[PDB]
Coordinates of C-alpha atoms in Angstrom, one line a residue:
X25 CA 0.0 0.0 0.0
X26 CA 1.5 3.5 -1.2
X27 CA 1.4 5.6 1.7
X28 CA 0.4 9.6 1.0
X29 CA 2.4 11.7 -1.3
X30 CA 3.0 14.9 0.5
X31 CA 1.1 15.6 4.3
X32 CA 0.8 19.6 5.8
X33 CA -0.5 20.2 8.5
X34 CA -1.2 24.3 10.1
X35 CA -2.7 25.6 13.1
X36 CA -5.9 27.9 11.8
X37 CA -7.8 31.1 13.1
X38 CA -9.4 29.2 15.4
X39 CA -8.7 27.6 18.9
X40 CA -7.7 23.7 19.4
X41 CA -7.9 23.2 16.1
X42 CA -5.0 21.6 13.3
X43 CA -5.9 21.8 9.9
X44 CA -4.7 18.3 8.5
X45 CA -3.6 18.6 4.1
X46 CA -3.1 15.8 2.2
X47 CA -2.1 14.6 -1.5
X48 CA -2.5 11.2 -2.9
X49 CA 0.8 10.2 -4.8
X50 CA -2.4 8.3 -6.7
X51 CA -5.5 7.0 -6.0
X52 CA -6.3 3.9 -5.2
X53 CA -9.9 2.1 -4.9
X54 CA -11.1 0.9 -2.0
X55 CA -8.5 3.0 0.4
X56 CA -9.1 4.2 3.9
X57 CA -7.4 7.0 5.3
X58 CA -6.1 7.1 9.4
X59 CA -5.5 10.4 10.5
X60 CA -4.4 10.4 13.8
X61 CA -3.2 12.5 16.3
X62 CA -1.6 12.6 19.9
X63 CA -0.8 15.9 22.1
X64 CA 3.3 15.6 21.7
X65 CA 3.5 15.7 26.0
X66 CA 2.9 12.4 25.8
X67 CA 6.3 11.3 23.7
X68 CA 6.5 8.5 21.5
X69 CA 4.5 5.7 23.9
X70 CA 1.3 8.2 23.9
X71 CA -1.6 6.9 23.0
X72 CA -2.8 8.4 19.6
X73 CA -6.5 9.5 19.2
X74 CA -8.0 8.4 15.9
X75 CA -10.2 8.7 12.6
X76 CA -10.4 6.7 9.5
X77 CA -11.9 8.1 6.6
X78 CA -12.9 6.7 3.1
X79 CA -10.4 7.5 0.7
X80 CA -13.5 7.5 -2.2
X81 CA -14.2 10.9 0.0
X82 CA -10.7 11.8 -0.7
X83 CA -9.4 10.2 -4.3
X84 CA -6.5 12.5 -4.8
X85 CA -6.2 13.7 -1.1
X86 CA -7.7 16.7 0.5
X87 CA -8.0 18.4 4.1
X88 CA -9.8 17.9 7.1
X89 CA -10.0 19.8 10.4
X90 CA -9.0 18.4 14.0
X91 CA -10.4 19.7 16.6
X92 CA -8.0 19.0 20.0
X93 CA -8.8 18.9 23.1
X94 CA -6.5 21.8 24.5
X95 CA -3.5 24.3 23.5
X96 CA -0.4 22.1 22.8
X97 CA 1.4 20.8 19.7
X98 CA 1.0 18.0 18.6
X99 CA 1.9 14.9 16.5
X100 CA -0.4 14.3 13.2
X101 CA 0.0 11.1 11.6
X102 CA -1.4 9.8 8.4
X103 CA -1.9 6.2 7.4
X104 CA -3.2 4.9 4.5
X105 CA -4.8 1.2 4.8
X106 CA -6.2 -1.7 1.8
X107 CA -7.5 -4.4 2.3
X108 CA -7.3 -7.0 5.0
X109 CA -6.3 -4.0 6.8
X110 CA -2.3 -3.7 5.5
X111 CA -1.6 -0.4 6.7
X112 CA 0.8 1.6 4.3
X113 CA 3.8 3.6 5.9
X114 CA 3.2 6.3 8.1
X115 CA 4.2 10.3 7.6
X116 CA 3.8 12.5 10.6
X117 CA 4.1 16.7 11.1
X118 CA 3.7 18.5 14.0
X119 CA 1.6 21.4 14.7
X120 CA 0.6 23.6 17.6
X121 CA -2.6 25.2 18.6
X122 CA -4.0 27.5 21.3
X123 CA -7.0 28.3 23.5
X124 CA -8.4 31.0 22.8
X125 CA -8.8 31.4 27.0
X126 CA -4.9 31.4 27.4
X127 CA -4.6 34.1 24.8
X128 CA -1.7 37.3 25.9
X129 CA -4.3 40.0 27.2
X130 CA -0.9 41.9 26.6
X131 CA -0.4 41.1 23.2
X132 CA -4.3 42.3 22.5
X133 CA -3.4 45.4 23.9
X134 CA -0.1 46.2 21.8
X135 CA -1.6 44.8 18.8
X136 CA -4.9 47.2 18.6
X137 CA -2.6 50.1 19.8
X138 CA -0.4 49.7 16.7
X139 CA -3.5 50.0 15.0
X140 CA -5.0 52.8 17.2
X141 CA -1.7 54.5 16.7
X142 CA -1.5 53.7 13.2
X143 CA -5.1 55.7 12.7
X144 CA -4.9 58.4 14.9
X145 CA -1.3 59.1 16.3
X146 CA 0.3 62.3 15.3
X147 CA -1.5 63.1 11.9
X148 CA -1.2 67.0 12.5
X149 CA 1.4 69.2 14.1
X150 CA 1.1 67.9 17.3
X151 CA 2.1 64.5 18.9
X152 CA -1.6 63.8 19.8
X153 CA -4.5 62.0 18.9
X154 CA -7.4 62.6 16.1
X155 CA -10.8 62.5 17.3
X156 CA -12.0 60.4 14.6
X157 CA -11.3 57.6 12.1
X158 CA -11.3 57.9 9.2
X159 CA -9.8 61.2 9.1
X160 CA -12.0 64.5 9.3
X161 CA -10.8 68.0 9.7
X162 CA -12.6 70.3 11.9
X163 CA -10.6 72.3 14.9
X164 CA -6.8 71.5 15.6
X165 CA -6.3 69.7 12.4
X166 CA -8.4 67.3 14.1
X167 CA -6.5 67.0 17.1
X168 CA -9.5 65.5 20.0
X169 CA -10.3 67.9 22.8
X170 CA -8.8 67.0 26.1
X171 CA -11.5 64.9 27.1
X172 CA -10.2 62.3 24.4
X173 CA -6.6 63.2 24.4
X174 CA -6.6 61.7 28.0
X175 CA -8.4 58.8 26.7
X176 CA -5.3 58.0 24.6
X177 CA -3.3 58.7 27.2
X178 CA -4.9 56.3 29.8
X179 CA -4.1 53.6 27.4
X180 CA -0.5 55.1 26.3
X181 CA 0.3 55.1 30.2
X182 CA -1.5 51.4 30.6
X183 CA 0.6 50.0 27.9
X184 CA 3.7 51.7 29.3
X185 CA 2.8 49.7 32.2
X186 CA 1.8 46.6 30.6
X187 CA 5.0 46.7 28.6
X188 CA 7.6 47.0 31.4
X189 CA 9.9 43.4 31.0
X190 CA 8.0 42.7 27.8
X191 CA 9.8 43.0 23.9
X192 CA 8.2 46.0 23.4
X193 CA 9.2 48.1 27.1
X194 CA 11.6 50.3 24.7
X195 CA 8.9 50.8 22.0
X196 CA 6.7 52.4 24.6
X197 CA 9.2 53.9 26.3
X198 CA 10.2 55.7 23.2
X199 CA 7.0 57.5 22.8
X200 CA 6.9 59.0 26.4
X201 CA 8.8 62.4 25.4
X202 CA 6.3 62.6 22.6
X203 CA 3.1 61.7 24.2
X204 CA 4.1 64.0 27.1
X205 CA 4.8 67.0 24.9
X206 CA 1.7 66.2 23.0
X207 CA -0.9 66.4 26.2
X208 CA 0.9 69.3 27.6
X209 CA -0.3 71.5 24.6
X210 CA -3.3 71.7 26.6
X211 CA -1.8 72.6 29.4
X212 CA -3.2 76.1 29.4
X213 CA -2.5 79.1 31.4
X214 CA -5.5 81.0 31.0
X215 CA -7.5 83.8 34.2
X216 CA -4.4 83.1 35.7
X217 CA -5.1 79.4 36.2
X218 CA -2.9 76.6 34.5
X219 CA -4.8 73.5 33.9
X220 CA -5.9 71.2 31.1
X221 CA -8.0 73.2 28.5
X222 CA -10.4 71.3 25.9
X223 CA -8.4 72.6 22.9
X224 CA -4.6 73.4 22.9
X225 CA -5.2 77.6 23.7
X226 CA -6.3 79.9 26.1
X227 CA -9.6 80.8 25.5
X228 CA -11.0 77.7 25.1
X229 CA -13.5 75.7 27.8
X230 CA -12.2 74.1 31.0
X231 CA -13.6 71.7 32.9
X232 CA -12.6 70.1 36.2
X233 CA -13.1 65.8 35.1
X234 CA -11.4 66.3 31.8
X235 CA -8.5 67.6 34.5
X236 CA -8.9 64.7 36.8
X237 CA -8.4 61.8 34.2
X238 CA -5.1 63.2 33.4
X239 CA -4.1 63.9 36.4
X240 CA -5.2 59.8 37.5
X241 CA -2.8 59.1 34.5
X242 CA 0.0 61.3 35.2
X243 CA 0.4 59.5 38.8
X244 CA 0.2 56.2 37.3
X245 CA 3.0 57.3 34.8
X246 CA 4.6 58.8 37.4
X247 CA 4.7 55.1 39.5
X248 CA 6.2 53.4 36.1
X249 CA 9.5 55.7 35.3
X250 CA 9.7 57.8 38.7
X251 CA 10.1 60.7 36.6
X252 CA 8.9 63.8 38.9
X253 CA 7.1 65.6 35.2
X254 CA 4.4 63.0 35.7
X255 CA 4.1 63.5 39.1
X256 CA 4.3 67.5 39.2
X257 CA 0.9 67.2 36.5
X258 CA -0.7 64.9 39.0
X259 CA -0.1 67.0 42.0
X260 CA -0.7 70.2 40.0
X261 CA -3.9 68.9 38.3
X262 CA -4.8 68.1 42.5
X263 CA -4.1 71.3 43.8
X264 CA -6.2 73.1 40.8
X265 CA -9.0 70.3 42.3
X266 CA -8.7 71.6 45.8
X267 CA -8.5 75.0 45.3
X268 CA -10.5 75.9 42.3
X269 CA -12.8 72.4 42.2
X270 CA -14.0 72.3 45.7
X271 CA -16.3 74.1 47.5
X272 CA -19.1 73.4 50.2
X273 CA -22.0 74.4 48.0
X274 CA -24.2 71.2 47.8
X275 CA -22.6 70.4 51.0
X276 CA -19.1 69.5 49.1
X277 CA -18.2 68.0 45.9
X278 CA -16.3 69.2 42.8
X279 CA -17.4 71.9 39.9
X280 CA -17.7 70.4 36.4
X281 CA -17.2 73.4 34.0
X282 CA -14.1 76.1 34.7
X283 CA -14.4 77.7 31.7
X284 CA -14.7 79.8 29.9
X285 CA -19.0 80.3 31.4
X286 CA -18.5 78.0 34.8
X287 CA -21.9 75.6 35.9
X288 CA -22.4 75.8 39.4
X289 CA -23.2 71.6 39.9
X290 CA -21.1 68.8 41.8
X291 CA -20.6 66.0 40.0
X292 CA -19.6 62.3 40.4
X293 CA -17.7 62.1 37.4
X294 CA -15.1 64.9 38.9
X295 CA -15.3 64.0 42.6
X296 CA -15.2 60.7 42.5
X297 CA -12.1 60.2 40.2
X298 CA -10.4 63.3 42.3
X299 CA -10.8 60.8 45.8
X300 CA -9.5 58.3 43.2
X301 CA -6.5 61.1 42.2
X302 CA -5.9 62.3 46.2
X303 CA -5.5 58.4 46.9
X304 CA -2.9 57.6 44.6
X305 CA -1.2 60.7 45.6
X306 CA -1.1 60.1 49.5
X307 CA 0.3 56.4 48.7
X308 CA 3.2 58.0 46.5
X309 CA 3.9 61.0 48.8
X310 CA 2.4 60.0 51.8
X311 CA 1.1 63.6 52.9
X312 CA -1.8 63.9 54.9
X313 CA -3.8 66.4 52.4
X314 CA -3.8 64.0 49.9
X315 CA -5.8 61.5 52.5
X316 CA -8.0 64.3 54.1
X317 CA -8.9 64.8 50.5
X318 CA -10.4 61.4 49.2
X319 CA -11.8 61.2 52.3
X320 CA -13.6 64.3 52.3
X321 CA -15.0 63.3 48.2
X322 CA -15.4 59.8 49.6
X323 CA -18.1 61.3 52.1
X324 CA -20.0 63.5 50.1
X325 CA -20.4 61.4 47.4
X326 CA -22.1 58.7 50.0
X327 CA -24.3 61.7 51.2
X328 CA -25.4 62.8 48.6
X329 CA -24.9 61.1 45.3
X330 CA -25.4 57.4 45.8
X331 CA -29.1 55.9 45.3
X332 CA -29.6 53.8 48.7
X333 CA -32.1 52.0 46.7
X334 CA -29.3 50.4 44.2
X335 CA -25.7 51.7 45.6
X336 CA -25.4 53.4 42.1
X337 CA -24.6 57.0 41.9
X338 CA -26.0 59.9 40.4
X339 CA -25.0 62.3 37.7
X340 CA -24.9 65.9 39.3
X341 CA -25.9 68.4 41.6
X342 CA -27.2 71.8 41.6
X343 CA -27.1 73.8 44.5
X344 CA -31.0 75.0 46.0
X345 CA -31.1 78.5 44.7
X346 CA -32.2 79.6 48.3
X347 CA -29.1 77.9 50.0
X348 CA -26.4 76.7 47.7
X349 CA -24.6 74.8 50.8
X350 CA -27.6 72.7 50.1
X351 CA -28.3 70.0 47.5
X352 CA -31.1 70.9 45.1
X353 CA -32.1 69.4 41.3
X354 CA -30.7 66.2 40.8
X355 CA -29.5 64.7 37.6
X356 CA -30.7 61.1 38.7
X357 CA -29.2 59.0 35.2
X358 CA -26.7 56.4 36.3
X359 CA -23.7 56.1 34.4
X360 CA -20.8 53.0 34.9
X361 CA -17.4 55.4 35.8
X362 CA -19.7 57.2 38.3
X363 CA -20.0 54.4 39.9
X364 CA -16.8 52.6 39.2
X365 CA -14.9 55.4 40.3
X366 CA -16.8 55.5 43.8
X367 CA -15.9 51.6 44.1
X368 CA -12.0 52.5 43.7
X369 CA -12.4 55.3 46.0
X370 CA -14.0 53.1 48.4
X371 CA -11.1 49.9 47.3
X372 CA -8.2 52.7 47.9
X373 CA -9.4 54.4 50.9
X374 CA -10.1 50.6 52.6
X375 CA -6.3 49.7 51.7
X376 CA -5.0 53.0 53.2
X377 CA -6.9 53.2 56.4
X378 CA -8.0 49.5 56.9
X379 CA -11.5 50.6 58.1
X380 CA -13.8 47.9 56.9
X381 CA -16.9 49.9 56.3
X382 CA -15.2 51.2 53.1
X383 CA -14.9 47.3 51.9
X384 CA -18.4 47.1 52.8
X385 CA -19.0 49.9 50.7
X386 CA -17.1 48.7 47.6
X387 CA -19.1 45.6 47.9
X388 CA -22.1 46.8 47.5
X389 CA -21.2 49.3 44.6
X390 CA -19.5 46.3 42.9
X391 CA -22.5 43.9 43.1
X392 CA -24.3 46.8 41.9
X393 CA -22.0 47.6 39.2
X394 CA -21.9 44.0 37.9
X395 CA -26.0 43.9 37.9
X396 CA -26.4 47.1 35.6
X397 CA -23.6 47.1 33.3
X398 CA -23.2 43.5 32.6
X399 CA -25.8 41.3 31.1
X400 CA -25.5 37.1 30.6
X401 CA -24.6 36.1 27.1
X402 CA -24.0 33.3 24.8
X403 CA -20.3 33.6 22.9
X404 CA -20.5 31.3 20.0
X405 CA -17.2 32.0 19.1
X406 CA -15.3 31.4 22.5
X407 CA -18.8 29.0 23.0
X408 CA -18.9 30.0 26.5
X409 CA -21.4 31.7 28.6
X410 CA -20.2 34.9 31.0
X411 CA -21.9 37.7 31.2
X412 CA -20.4 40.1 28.7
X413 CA -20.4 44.2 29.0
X414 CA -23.6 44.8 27.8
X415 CA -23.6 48.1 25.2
X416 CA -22.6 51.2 26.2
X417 CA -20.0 54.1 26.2
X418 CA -16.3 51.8 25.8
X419 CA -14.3 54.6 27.8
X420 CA -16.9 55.0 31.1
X421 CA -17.1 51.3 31.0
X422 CA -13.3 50.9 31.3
X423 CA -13.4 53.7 33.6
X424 CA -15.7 51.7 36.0
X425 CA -13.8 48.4 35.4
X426 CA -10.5 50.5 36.8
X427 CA -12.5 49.8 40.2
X428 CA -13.3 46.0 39.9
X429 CA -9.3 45.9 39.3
X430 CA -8.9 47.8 42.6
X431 CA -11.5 45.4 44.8
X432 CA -9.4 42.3 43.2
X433 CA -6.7 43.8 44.7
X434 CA -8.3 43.6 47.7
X435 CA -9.9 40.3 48.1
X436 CA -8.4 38.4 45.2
X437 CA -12.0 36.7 43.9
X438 CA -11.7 37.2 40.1
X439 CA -15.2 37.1 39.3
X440 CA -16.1 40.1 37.9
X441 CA -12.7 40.6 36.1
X442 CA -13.2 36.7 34.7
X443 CA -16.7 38.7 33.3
X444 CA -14.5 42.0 31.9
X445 CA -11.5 39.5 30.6
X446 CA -14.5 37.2 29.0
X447 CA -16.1 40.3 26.8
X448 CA -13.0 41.7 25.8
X449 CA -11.9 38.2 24.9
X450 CA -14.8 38.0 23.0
X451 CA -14.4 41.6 21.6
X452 CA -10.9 40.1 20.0
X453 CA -12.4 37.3 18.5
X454 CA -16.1 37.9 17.8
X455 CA -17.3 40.1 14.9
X456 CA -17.2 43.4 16.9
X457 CA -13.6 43.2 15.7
X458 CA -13.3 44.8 13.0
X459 CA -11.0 44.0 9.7
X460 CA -9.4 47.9 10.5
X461 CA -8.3 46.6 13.4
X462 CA -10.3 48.7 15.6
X463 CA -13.3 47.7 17.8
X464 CA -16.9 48.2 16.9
X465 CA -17.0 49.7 20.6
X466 CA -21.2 50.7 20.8
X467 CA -21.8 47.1 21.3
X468 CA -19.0 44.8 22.4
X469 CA -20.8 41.3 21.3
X470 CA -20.7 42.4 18.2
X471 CA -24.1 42.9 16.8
X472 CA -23.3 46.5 16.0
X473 CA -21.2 47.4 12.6
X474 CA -19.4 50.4 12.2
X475 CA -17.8 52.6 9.7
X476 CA -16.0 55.4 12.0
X477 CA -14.9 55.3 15.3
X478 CA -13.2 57.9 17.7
X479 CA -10.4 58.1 19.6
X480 CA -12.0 58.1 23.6
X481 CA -13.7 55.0 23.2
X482 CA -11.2 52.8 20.9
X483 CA -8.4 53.5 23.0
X484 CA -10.8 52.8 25.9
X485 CA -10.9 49.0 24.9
X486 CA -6.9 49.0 24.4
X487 CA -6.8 50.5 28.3
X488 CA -8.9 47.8 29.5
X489 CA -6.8 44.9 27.5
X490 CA -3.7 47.0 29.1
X491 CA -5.3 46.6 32.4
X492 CA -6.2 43.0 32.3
X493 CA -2.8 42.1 30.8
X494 CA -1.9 44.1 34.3
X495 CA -4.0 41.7 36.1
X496 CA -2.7 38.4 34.7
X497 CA 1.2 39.7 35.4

């Protein structure tokens, strides 16, 4: 019995799988076909698993798919057997395949920010990022406001992170004088106030959140290199916070718009992340205002902006017109980062002091968290069930996730971030992937094509892949 003329065999785009190639040196009536396989672990006494085929199915050869049982490489075999079951020599080729479970969260991350950077990295004057892609024009040669400049940041300074004792630490490390000289355009001195203006100018809008994100990513940059730059915009973006952010109308709480005509409302999405901000800064500098700070955000944001009914916080604020110290018309809508950012208050201020009601706390808002944002869901790809992000805005969904990494921290049960690392798993695989290379982010299952996406929420999703690669180190 002639054995087969030529076998090939390739791992394929999908997981435990070998795709098995064959050629017929001729065909023969009446020939079977073994292909057989064994995980290569198992050396040369492993047992082999087994098909046989009818080589009628197959007259000059052709190709058939294993599915494996796990990630491994392993040992293919084909056989070609005639009658009275003589068995023709054997040819063999190894192959390897993976799990789509075991995939590098890290290598995710770097490869959609090649893309992200690829798209809308430095395509005017200034190293910073477009709002949009494909390109449009508008203000700034494009350039995103703030708002989304710190969005790219947040992943810039997660990858810088992520990449530290990886092959690509230099690559990110070589964009640092860049991506610092390109935020710090908006570092604005205007009224004789320095701090992060929505457009690269004085005389533009201000607002105190748009501040606080940077200023979150600044001390996390800071953490990574040690370089006091980083650490001089967190501490700067705090103290224009404290001094210009807070005040005791509504009882406490920080302002939302600076400039250039300022609201008079408190709001969760700049106190919250400034408790966040005054944490991080009392664990790198250790001084007391810093602490007396988060605390002080921590508490009015329990008084007055959390829903007792669902531990989920409110929007904003506005002082009663006949007593601003007190709270009046409440913007009730429940976003994710307003309340993801209350959980890592409540994560960080627990791992500082060691008071147990802020664990309490967390607890809650977590459950809570989990119960709105995330919704249970069929993957047919990974065909696994978790309950996947349902749709929403990418960048306050990766903002809220920032506090399920902080509670892990805490009490290690992975949960929740088994949920996140599930969806964004799914993101990489499923069809909200898109053949750009950028995520259909409206709607990370997938159901949702897209022909344009901008700059906050993609590099959102390469933040969170930053963060769970984070996770798994």
């Amino acid at each position: 019995i002639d054995p087969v003329g030529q076998l090939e065999v390739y791992k394929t785009s999908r997981e435990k799988e070998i795709l098995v190639k064959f050629i017929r040196t001729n065909y023969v009536k009446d020939i079977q076909i073994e292909i057989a396989y064994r995980n290569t672990e198992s050396g040369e006494n492993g047992e082999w698993t087994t098909i046989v085929l009818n080589g009628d199915n197959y007259k000059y050869g052709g190709n058939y798919l294993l599915q494996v049982p796990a990630e491994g490489t392993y040992e293919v075999a084909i056989t070609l057997i005639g009658a009275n079951e003589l068995r023709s020599e054997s040819k063999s080729q190894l192959a390897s395949t993976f799990e789509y479970v075991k995939t590098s969260m890290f290598d995710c991350a770097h490869s959609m920010m090649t893309c992200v950077i690829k798209y809308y990295y430095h395509k005017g004057p200034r190293t910073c990022w477009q709002t949009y892609y494909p390109k449009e024009q508008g203000y700034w040669d494009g350039d995103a406001v703030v708002w989304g400049q710190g969005g790219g940041l947040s992943a810039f300074v997660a990858l810088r992170e992520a990449s530290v004792d990886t092959e690509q630490e230099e690559y990110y490390r070589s964009l640092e004088d860049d991506m610092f000289k390109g935020i710090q355009h908006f570092w604005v001195t205007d009224h004789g106030r320095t701090a992060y203006s929505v457009y690269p100018d004085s005389g533009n809008d201000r607002f105190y959140d748009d501040n606080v994100w940077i200023g979150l990513d600044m001390a996390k940059w800071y953490a990574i290199s040690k370089d006091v730059r980083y650490l001089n915009q967190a501490k700067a973006v705090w103290d224009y916070l404290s001094q210009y952010g807070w005040d005791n109308t509504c009882g406490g709480g920080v302002h939302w718009k600076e400039l250039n005509e300022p609201s008079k409302s408190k709001h969760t999405c700049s106190t919250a992340p400034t408790g966040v901000l005054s944490c991080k800064l009392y664990q790198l500098t250790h001084e007391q205002k810093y602490l007396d700070k988060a605390i002080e955000c921590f508490n009015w944001l329990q008084a007055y902006m959390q829903d007792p009914s669902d531990h989920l916080y409110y929007d904003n604020v506005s002082p009663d017109p006949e007593d601003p110290t007190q709270p009046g018309r409440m913007e009730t809508n429940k976003y994710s980062y307003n309340s993801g950012q209350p959980l890592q208050l409540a994560c960080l201020l627990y791992k500082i002091t060691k008071n147990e009601s802020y664990l309490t706390v967390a607890h809650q808002i977590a459950e809570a968290c989990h119960k709105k944002w995330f919704t249970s869901y069929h993957s047919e790809v990974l065909q696994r069930d978790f309950n996947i992000l349902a749709p929403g805005h990418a960048w306050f969904n990766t903002v809220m996730c920032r506090g399920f990494f902080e509670l892990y921290s805490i009490d290690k049960n992975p949960s929740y971030l088994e949920d996140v690392r599930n969806t964004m798993l799914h993101a990489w695989f499923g069809k909200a992937h898109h053949i750009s290379g950028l995520i259909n982010d409206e709607d990370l299952s997938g159901a949702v094509s897209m022909n344009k996406w901008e700059i906050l929420r993609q590099a959102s999703l390469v933040e969170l892949y930053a963060l769970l690669a984070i996770w798994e180190s």
